């Protein structure tokens, strides 16, 4: 209407909205992570110390999937590069083990 013919063939600079968007994307990602974490737990049932090890490996695969969404845009379409991969999953780790908790279904966790 007003500036009807504006027709922006492109939006403005990267916006904190979409930043938070991709961020929560990573959040639900870590969610799925903790999910697969309890999953592998059940797959082994072990509360064994190797548990947190497989959890590490999981988060590894997580950053690897982040890489799989590469598009060469490491910083470009995804503002930062390193801290993104540094996804601070500590509390969800708790969750993940909590996930592992139900993995106890066989015999495991008491």
């Amino acid at each position: 209407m007003a500036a009807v013919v504006a027709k922006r063939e492109g939006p403005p600079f990267i916006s904190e909205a979409a930043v938070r968007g991709n961020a929560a994307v990573l959040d639900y990602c870590r969610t799925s992570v903790s999910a697969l974490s309890g999953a592998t737990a059940g797959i082994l049932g072990l509360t064994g110390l190797y548990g947190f090890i497989f959890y590490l490996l999981a988060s590894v695969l997580l950053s690897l999937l982040l890489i799989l969404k590469a598009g060469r845009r490491w910083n470009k379409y995804f503002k930062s590069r390193r801290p993104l991969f540094t996804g601070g999953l500590i509390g969800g780790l708790f969750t993940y083990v909590l996930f592992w908790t139900f993995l106890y279904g066989m015999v495991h966790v008491y």
Binding site: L36, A39, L65, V107
Partner: protein, 65 residues
């Protein structure tokens, strides 16, 4: 991955979970019920576990959105 395929493979992950559930049933059965405690991780079961992990991987991948 494809989003319809995403929901499908997520369901496939849950299905592998249930397969493993029946498998662990049989395993603990052999162990205690059958009193044959040699019920180590069935190679089939371990392979299914790894496959389900990978299914979850590609699932979340497509689940990026």
């Amino acid at each position: 991955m494809a989003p319809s395929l995403w929901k499908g493979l997520v369901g496939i992950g849950l299905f592998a979970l249930a397969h493993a559930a029946f498998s662990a049933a049989q395993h603990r059965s052999y162990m205690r019920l059958t009193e044959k405690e040699d019920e180590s991780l069935p190679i089939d079961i371990v392979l299914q576990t790894l496959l389900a992990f990978a299914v979850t991987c590609y699932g979340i991948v497509h689940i990026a959105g």
